[PDB]
């Protein structure tokens, strides 16, 4: 449970111990960033004029 | 009750709200297959199973034994 332990508490600590925390980075983070976008984009809170690419989210 | 499902044809998710028997005409939103604002989550994904398998699920035996000893 990591009782006997940003970037060191992540890609390490909460990685070698905890199996995969990257499944919550593709199941919780990306989906939220992809809904916040297109929602803030349907409303006039972020610019909407890519016309170059689709600007992927990592 | 809010129910969203795949379009039987080559379509996107169809969303509607049912309160009591009949739906509400006001709620007829349709969302793309990509930007679905409901976002079901799963911690440990297993093929076949629709969801579940918490992290503490596979340490439940240790908790059982430790709690028995401490009791």
């Amino acid at each position: 449970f990591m009782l006997n332990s940003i970037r060191y508490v992540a890609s390490e600590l909460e990685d070698t111990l905890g199996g995969v925390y990257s499944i919550l980075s593709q199941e919780l983070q990306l989906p939220l960033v992809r809904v916040l976008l297109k929602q803030l984009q349907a409303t006039q809170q972020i610019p909407e004029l890519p016309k170059e690419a689709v600007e992927p989210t990592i | 009750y809010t129910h969203i499902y795949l379009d039987e044809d080559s379509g996107e998710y169809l969303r509607y709200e049912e309160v009591e028997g009949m739906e509400v005409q006001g709620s007829d939103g349709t969302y793309p297959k990509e930007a679905c604002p409901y976002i079901p989550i799963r911690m440990v994904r297993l093929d076949g199973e629709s969801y579940g398998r918490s992290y503490i699920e596979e340490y439940l035996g240790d908790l059982r034994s430790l709690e028995n000893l401490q009791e």
Partner: protein
């Protein structure tokens, strides 16, 4: 008027699928009971219910630490 997967109705599909959700609810209830029990109470559980604290008391700390 609704097409496939929705002709019967939201209530009916929810009732049908709730039976397939039972094992996950039971395992979640067990995990909650051995860790902090108040997190995932049973459907019947309501006010006037006392959540006996686990003896081990390491599950609660581990859950809190993982969440943090």
């Amino acid at each position: 008027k609704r097409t496939g997967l929705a002709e019967d109705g939201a209530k009916s599909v929810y009732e049908r699928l709730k039976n397939d959700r039972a094992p996950y609810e039971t395992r979640a209830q067990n995990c909650a009971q051995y860790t902090i029990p108040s997190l995932f109470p049973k459907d019947s559980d309501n006010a006037s219910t006392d959540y006996q604290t686990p003896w081990q008391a390491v599950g609660a700390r581990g859950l809190n630490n993982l969440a943090s």
